[PDB]
Amino acid sequence: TQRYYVERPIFSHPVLQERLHTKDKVPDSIADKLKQAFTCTPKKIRNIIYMFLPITKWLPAYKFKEYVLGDLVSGISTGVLQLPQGLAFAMLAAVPPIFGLYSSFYPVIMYCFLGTSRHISIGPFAVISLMIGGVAVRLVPDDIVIPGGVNATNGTEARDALRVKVAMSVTLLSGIIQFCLGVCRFGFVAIYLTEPLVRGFTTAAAVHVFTSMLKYLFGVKTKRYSGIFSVVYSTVAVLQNVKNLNVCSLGVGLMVFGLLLGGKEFNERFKEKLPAPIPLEFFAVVMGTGISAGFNLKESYNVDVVGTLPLGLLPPANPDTSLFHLVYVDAIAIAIVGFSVTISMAKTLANKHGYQVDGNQELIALGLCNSIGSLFQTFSISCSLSRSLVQEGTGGKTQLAGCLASLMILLVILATGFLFESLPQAVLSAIVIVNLKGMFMQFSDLPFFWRTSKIELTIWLTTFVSSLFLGLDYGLITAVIIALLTVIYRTQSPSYKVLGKLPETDVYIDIDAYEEVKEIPGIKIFQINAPIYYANSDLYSNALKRKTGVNPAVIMGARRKAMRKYAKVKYPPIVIKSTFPEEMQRFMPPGDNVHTVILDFTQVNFIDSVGVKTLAGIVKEYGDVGIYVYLAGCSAQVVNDLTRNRFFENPALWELLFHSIHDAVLGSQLREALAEQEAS
Amino acid sequence: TQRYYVERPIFSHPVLQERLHTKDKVPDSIADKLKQAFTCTPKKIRNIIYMFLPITKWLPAYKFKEYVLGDLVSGISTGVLQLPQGLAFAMLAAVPPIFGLYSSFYPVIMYCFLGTSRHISIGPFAVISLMIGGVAVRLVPDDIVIPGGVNATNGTEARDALRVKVAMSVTLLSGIIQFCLGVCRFGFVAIYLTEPLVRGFTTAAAVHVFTSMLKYLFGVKTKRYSGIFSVVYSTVAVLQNVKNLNVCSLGVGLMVFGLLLGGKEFNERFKEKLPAPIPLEFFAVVMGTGISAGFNLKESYNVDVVGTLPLGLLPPANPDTSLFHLVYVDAIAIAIVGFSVTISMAKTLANKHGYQVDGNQELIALGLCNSIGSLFQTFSISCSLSRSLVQEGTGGKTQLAGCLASLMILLVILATGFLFESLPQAVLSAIVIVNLKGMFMQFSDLPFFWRTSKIELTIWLTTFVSSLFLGLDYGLITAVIIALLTVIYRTQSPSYKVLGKLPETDVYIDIDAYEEVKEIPGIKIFQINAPIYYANSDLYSNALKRKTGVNPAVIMGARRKAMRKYAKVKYPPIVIKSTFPEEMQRFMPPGDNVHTVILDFTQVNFIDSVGVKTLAGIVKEYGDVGIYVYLAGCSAQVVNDLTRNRFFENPALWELLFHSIHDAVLGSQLREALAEQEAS
Ligand SMILES: CC(C)CCC[C@@H](C)[C@H]1CC[C@H]2[C@@H]3CC=C4C[C@@H](O)CC[C@]4(C)[C@H]3CC[C@]12C
Ligand SMILES: CC(C)CCC[C@@H](C)[C@H]1CC[C@H]2[C@@H]3CC=C4C[C@@H](O)CC[C@]4(C)[C@H]3CC[C@]12C
Ligand SMILES: CCCCCCCCCCCCCC
Ligand SMILES: CCCCCCCCCCCCCC
Ligand SMILES: CCCCCCCCCCCCCC
Ligand SMILES: CCCCCCCCCCCCCC
Ligand SMILES: CCCCCCCCCCCC
Ligand SMILES: CCCCCCCCCCCC
Ligand SMILES: CCCCCCCCCCCC
Ligand SMILES: CCCCCCCCCCCC
Ligand SMILES: CCCCCCCCCCCC
Ligand SMILES: CCCCCCCCCCCC
Ligand SMILES: CCCCCCCCCCCC
Ligand SMILES: CCCCCCCCCCCC
Ligand SMILES: CCCCCCCCCC
Ligand SMILES: CCCCCCCCCC
Ligand SMILES: CCCCCCCCCC
Ligand SMILES: CCCCCCCCCC
Ligand SMILES: CCCCCCCCCC
Ligand SMILES: CCCCCCCCCC
Ligand SMILES: CCCCCCCCCC
Ligand SMILES: CCCCCCCCCC
Ligand SMILES: CCCCCCCCCC
Ligand SMILES: CCCCCCCCCC
Ligand SMILES: CCCCCCCCCC
Ligand SMILES: CCCCCCCCCC
Ligand SMILES: CCCCCCCCCC
Ligand SMILES: CCCCCCCCCC
Ligand SMILES: CCCCCCCCCC
Ligand SMILES: CCCCCCCCCC
Ligand SMILES: CCCCCCCCCC
Ligand SMILES: CCCCCCCCCC
Ligand SMILES: CCCCCCCCCC
Ligand SMILES: CCCCCCCCCC
Ligand SMILES: CCCCCCCC
Ligand SMILES: CCCCCCCC
Ligand SMILES: CCCCCCCC
Ligand SMILES: CCCCCCCC
Ligand SMILES: CCCCCCCC
Ligand SMILES: CCCCCCCC
Ligand SMILES: CCCCCCCC
């Protein structure tokens, strides 16, 4: 083994700078930087196409023998859940369920072309559907007057058509906003969605879905709520009118709920013995339709059912832009929430599978999906969190599984929709609630973060509470800001350490940590692992004066008290020699006799104007009582901050900067030795 | 001169830990910490009294011969401006001007006892007065019905009394809120008001005052505005109805404005020849009253005047708590803004005079002043920024100058108020606008910050724009949040440096800076002066792969391409030896041949779970291509973050940590030498 051997002079800043000559920066002109960015080599255009059409990259690289079985199983398992979720979330959007089926077909196909994630399930989302239904009923209330040429027994078809128009308009506007944000590179903000924040946000979204499904589980009529405390209002309303529940709807839904839970437990426990998981949503739906049609519950027990599902696809139709001025705010909110839900879950799966997702491409894909789908009578979509978990956890590899699920939805739309007309809405509710279980499993993060980082546990809990009680829009921005403020908290509560020296080395460690490091007599070394900006500087100065035990104000007060008791451009030197008489020093209380204070700046990333003022004050106050202050390990950035401020207006302070703590200690000891040499 | 000499073994983490034994922490029980905090020694209670009654400290220490002349001159100069400001801001509060005089007397006396700043002028403030007038006219509109037993020629006395009741109620509530915040130690938030933020905020407040004075300068009638864009609305309204201006009011106000400007220029230019500045506000007021009374403008030209000022003080009266539920929101806002204005200017002067102000004591003093003053018919007060500048800049030392100014106000209240009844409101407006000049001088900060720190210039401009276009309440919190987010920006744009070694030393500096430092062959050293948390980790990894020129993905791709071209608990080792055939290596493109990458962690303050995942990925990806990754200079906090996460689940990574960059370089070179020794 070799050894660490260093033999060099003491490196103060002027001494080290004498050995360094400034290098010539290579010319980097902006005009040439733009010119070299427009070469348009074929590889560059191929990379651009891959960026904007990801299917052009991962489809030719499809490992058929390694991906086809997993994609097929995942596609079937995703489709059997996609159908009831589409119907239920269409109900949440105040539109006929067939439009939820449309929203489960076109955007998934488009996302298979434009999307970057290969595990999320694109489709209707409960929170987005709730927002769409809110704007739809605000623009088209239940007591609206329509001169549609019908008798007093109105079938509510015209009201449904008007609400569909409103939903398509808001969907087109939200898609336009999402596409514009993706073009303007707004997706960079996805970097501010940390893992605890994402998981707390998604758990809160799952609670939102569960709350939105309660009225359909119980069969009660409840006013629509959207905004702050909407989850609380919805739960309160459902519990308030729970006395008017449909007992048959609740019984059927609870039977489906229990059977689904049992089947999911069976699948999980026998995963190793089952070649593929049994699709239980298909059996749940079919059995439900059998029970409702066979006993004819729809009017026998007034059980709410899915209703008529017209067959066939609709021709493209232009949404009316005339409603934009009435919906744009909602369109903005839906755009934001849709992005936040899509990029969160995507990240959650990408980190699980060792790849990365482009936020800008996610925004572009969402915008194109929503805007083009609005032409095909599709309301605003997002990522379905529970269905994304199902798709990922059933062996899903690429987005071809989503294409297979969309093919199943298309089969329902074209030929077999009429078979589900008697399916009870309660059954749909139960299915959704059951599939929320995996989402709720994320609560297991609370102990884990409690063991790993209480700051990140705070981020998790704050994000959960915010996204729950406020909306998924206001709660998300609140959580992002608070998570960023945790960094300010970290800087405002740093580790203030007094350093001692490991004998016969140059290693300086916390004096209260290892029992072998010893403080150097006459020298105090103070260290902060944080910047010294405005929110920090006063705490840093107080901590220095408290932890080192060297308070210049206390020293001055003791000097004055001892004096009273014994009674019965040019710059002055920074350190004023203590002209304290020895006769008065006889009454001076004993102390540590510290002549130098070393400030360890190795971990100080930056210093602002307020921090520079604090540092100058520290130097002046300590020099007034005849104590030297040295800065050790100042980075080039910190030295530049000191120079941009008026810290080195007196050039003498250049002598206070040393390369390392050992350099400063050796320089201080050398200064003391020279002072003793010239004393006598 | 001595020399830097170090001779020791290479300090990897296990080697250094072998030399260190954990020290025993001294017992610090919370129960004993509370017990020692309740000793109640006489010095402790004296310090408590000094904290809560600052006058008990600085008054006995009053240097009479050194303070009396400055305090007297400052008191006269402050009072002559305090009278017109009180009248004008009472007009802004929709209350009779005598109540502004009351608000200029009691709170100043109380703040002389409870306040910590010794230079700010306590009294009515234009923004606080505008908020008070807004709530007063909202609760008591101009078209209110009062059965007061009067004829059709109502004198608006009952409406004024009702508005006074509303103002007193909101003042009492705001004072209670301020006192409670001071007790709950909310004043700590004053640490988040940095100097650029404070100066931008105060400049925006000055613009608010100037805007509020315009209608009285021109004599036009304008609807009250309060809230977002209130300054824009007020300026637009004044400019809209400027065609109905009173030409006589504008002429008198402009004459006073010009004479005041000339007098202030004379005072500034002849400060060295004048024993004391000439109080020009007194002459401006007196002359104005002479012109208005002598020519009898009040009805001859319909010039708005101050009006009747009743003599004598009012007995204490309890404000009606019954209005609290109607005003509490406004009371909250007024409490916040009043604090923000008071603690900002206070800090601005404390930093100017080398002392410090307690934010909690400022909150307590403001709350007591407002709550007690509401009993004496005083509406909510704050610090007057322009008058504080006048008081500080005229030789003010303590708050006895404010007491003298209050004595002048009391003299006006008791005996000589009737003399000012004909004083034109336009004159008051002009006086206020003139005294805003010093505030506007703060715009000179823009070039200064442009030269010192563009981040702090951004803070200044953002605070100014926010506090101007939004209110002083919403703009302030927006500015505080954005100023804190500048730290996030700093962490997200750090200095990524490739380090080279200064020959014959252990100094490692940026390779592109000094032309004497040389990169060590086979070794890449990468440094970031920032933490590696979630908002940083991806950028840090990309910057490492880009700046070092060592991209493991590019290496793997080149290896595969060369292979194709040539064709025509136990853990595995972290670094996989490159099993690349030499025959295939003949087609391998030439490279730097880097065997070790050193990550400089000396400036990394903390690392979160996302950053630890990124670091583990970096280590794994570089080891997959047979490249070692070393961490140099990891702090105890960073090592603890790595340990709390599952970074050292494989104990082998403990060997990747080195005390310094030179330690890591020597260890890497030793590893390479040993590998060559065992090769053959
Ligand atoms: C920095 C710390 C204190 C977090 C700040 C969170 C801020 C940005 C949050 C918390 C409460 C939020 C408000 C809560 C409710 C509403 C009403 C809604 O109709 C419009 C948005 C609005 C007005 C929100 C705006 C954003 C808001 C003010
Ligand atoms: C970087 C910073 C600005 C991020 C946080 C900004 C927050 C604090 C700002 C941005 C937008 C602001 C809102 C904009 C408009 C209004 C309406 C007004 O009638 C009450 C205040 C309120 C509701 C503001 C509250 C504060 C607010 C939410
Ligand atoms: C053990 C000392 C640290 C404890 C940290 C606990 C963090 C709890 C955060 C709760 C946030 C709730 C937001 C409403
Ligand atoms: C192990 C972590 C020590 C700190 C625990 C307490 C963390 C509290 C974080 C509060 C952040 C507040 C941001 C507004
Ligand atoms: C020279 C490159 C840096 C320039 C920094 C200029 C900062 C301007 C900030 C403007 C903020 C305005 C808020 C509305
Ligand atoms: C000399 C300073 C270099 C940086 C100049 C540009 C500063 C821009 C700061 C933007 C902060 C944004 C916070 C939301
Ligand atoms: C940045 C997102 C908004 C892009 C502009 C959309 C404006 C609506 C289109 C005009 C229709 C009248
Ligand atoms: C990606 C395919 C987009 C096809 C869009 C066709 C829109 C036709 C509108 C016709 C309106 C009458
Ligand atoms: C997010 C930027 C605005 C989004 C587009 C708004 C379009 C409003 C149209 C109003 C027409 C009168
Ligand atoms: C981002 C491109 C979206 C294209 C969808 C159609 C946009 C125009 C709507 C119809 C206008 C008549
Ligand atoms: C924290 C500031 C508010 C303190 C509580 C004030 C509540 C008003 C007093 C009750 C009057 C009805
Ligand atoms: C600091 C002096 C406070 C005096 C407060 C007296 C309040 C008297 C109220 C009488 C109401 C009729
Ligand atoms: C800032 C905390 C609240 C301030 C005090 C509110 C008092 C409201 C009284 C309502 C009475 C019905
Ligand atoms: C913080 C103490 C303020 C005291 C002022 C009086 C508070 C009570 C108001 C009158 C209630 C009847
Ligand atoms: C606790 C939820 C709110 C109250 C729900 C019960 C309302 C009355 C039911 C009879
Ligand atoms: C689901 C079968 C049981 C519930 C419905 C029948 C009994 C109640 C009728 C109102
Ligand atoms: C596979 C779909 C089976 C649907 C069962 C219910 C059919 C009702 C026919 C009356
Ligand atoms: C993605 C393929 C879309 C095809 C839509 C065809 C609609 C025809 C309606 C008559
Ligand atoms: C990550 C960016 C979050 C932005 C939230 C904006 C909410 C707007 C609600 C209308
Ligand atoms: C896999 C299902 C593909 C779509 C079948 C469409 C059948 C239409 C029958 C009218
Ligand atoms: C609302 C239901 C919450 C269920 C949490 C279950 C956590 C299990 C972790 C093992
Ligand atoms: C709101 C419900 C929270 C329940 C937390 C339980 C965590 C269990 C992890 C084992
Ligand atoms: C080891 C136990 C960790 C518990 C942390 C979760 C607390 C939840 C409070 C809401
Ligand atoms: C609004 C109150 C914010 C309080 C922040 C406390 C931070 C403590 C850092 C030591
Ligand atoms: C530019 C300020 C707003 C317009 C002021 C002029 C309004 C019309 C005056 C005749
Ligand atoms: C200051 C101007 C005095 C003369 C004004 C003449 C015009 C008066 C119009 C009401
Ligand atoms: C010092 C105050 C002088 C006031 C001048 C105006 C007096 C008007 C009397 C009619
Ligand atoms: C600070 C002294 C307050 C004295 C108020 C006296 C009021 C008397 C009214 C008759
Ligand atoms: C420094 C703390 C700023 C808090 C601003 C709160 C504004 C509330 C307006 C009602
Ligand atoms: C310096 C002025 C002190 C107050 C004088 C009060 C005189 C009252 C006369 C009725
Ligand atoms: C609104 C008036 C602004 C005046 C700025 C003057 C700055 C002078 C700096 C020397
Ligand atoms: C809004 C007016 C800004 C004017 C800035 C002028 C700065 C001059 C400093 C010398
Ligand atoms: C040296 C010139 C500095 C100018 C910075 C101020 C720019 C003001 C833009 C609003
Ligand atoms: C809302 C958009 C915020 C953009 C922040 C950009 C920070 C750049 C750091 C490199
Ligand atoms: C190389 C073609 C891949 C599939 C492209 C489909 C049309 C965008
Ligand atoms: C290299 C294969 C390109 C075509 C893939 C299949 C497209 C339908
Ligand atoms: C590795 C893929 C082999 C099969 C190619 C596709 C055959 C349909
Ligand atoms: C989800 C794949 C189809 C169903 C397979 C069931 C195997 C027991
Ligand atoms: C995705 C559900 C498929 C339902 C099929 C019904 C029988 C063709
Ligand atoms: C309330 C209905 C009771 C019968 C169904 C119970 C299902 C577990
Ligand atoms: C093992 C799951 C049992 C579920 C019983 C029914 C719950 C509603």
Ligand SMILES: CCCCCCCC
């Ligand atoms: C349609 C077949 C689904 C199950 C595939 C795997 C069977 C071993």
Ligand SMILES: CCCCCCCC
């Ligand atoms: C063997 C599992 C049966 C599950 C049936 C579920 C019907 C809803």
Ligand SMILES: CCCCCCCC
């Ligand atoms: C799922 C099969 C239900 C059969 C019900 C028959 C009632 C006549």
Ligand SMILES: CCCCCCCC
């Ligand atoms: C009114 C409830 C707001 C919850 C916000 C939580 C932020 C820590």
Ligand SMILES: CCCCCCCC
């Ligand atoms: C932990 C820092 C939070 C500061 C927020 C701003 C308070 C005014």
Ligand SMILES: CCCCCCCC
């Ligand atoms: C030592 C007394 C100073 C003045 C106190 C006045 C009453 C609080």
Ligand SMILES: CCCCCCCC
């Ligand atoms: C030591 C002087 C105490 C009294 C100061 C004056 C109080 C009116």
Ligand SMILES: CCCCCCCC
């Ligand atoms: C030395 C004490 C001076 C006290 C001055 C009091 C003036 C009211």
Ligand SMILES: CCCCCCCC
């Ligand atoms: C240093 C103060 C001397 C004067 C004391 C006060 C005399 C009235």
Ligand SMILES: CCCCCCCC
């Ligand atoms: C402001 C002190 C009183 C006025 C003095 C004027 C001296 C020319």
Ligand SMILES: CCCCCCCC
């Ligand atoms: C503060 C202004 C004083 C005005 C005095 C008027 C003549 C006694």
Ligand SMILES: CCCCCCCC
């Ligand atoms: C508009 C009035 C003009 C006469 C006064 C001018 C003062 C400078």
Ligand SMILES: CCCCCCCC
């Ligand atoms: C030296 C100041 C001259 C002021 C002239 C009048 C401006 C309105």
Ligand SMILES: CCCCCCCC
């Ligand atoms: C009342 C006198 C004010 C001026 C004091 C200073 C005179 C030299």
Ligand SMILES: CCCCCCCC
């Ligand atoms: C010599 C300065 C005279 C200033 C008079 C101001 C009257 C408003």
Ligand SMILES: CCCCCCCC
């Ligand atoms: C300031 C003196 C004004 C005198 C006006 C006299 C008019 C009769």
